[PDB]
Write a protein that binds this ligand. Sequence first.
Ligand SMILES: CN1C(=N)N[C@](CCC2CCCCC2)(C[C@H]2CCC[C@@H](NC(=O)Nc3ccccc3)C2)C1=O
Length: 386
Amino acid sequence: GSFVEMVDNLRGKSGQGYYVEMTVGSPPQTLNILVDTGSSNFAVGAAPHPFLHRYYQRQLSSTYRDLRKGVYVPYTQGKWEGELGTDLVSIPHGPNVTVRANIAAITESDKFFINGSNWEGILGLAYAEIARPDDSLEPFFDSLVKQTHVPNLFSLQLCGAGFPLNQSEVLASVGGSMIIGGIDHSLYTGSLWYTPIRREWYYEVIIVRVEINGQDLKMDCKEYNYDKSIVDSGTTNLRLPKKVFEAAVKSIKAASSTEKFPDGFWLGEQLVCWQAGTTPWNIFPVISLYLMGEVTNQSFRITILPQQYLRPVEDSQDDCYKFAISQSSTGTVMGAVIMEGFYVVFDRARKRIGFAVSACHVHDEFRTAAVEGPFVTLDMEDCGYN
Ligand SMILES: CN1C(=N)N[C@](CCC2CCCCC2)(C[C@H]2CCC[C@@H](NC(=O)Nc3ccccc3)C2)C1=O
């Protein structure tokens, strides 16, 4: 329905992350927390760090409980380490509840915190299977559902501005909404289409067909989900398996061939700039990802524009962008630049993910993002990797 208390409760952007305000401890300590559908730990800065102007002070919380256990979490680009405990947690622009939740107090980290991001911790919203050190550490959302009457569902509207936001603007701007326990109909247009959650660990899905401007990429659909496909608000780019990335870039280059871009642009390293207002959106193709539907032999598609996969960056008065599609060796990742096109419903209760066109997606007068269906698609279970 309508969840006015939670609409517009996010801030941030695709490259630095989207965050929500939370409070931890008694009396409450306010912290900004990155929303991460690609992990399952609630982990907060708990010691001084050059990029933090505040952190969780366990000694100041009367409700802090020490679990006397450490946690070490390496990931591709870095790591975070800390001390496990529990405390009372609330979301000011959220459901009006307070829960007793696990908290990893981060004491050491490498390439975790981001300078100028304005967030001090992360909220891992995925399932217990991928919680660290193991699946016995109950994730926040599981605690929330068990302890309150909050429905087992949340939805995310990540709003890309379509242009660079400076330090002051990104602090003053609305970055989107996280609706806890429901679906807010003001955040999307058209219909919601659902794809099954294949397995409850990451938010894993199955892609059954890929098009570039309606042209079928024509790969064996297992390639699109090798070794998994996930929906992850904690990754910036649309990341594709090596072979899929190579075929997609070849097709995107062919569609946009009226202009030549350097190799560094396609590698997502170098920006491309145009005179103010002259970005040639129309030369770049739309990208359609077909997802397995809830009905046997039925699929639907989500279509994104270059306004989603070209990420605005400051250079001058030129309009500059980075290519936000990159290679992966760990499967497809539908990151923030993809999520910015859609209102995404994480329907844990019904083991499904919903997509609808976002009321805040960036587009032009000629094209819009789309969510359409149904399409007849056979042997979709074969698209999943084992
Ligand atoms: C993809 N991804 C993700 N969605 N969450 C994590 C952890 C995954 C988790 C999966 C289950 C097993 C354990 C690991 C963490 C990520 C969160 C967003 C901010 C990032 N911070 C930076 O990247 N910071 C940074 C800072 C300076 C330089 C470079 C990067 C760090 C990750 O790698």
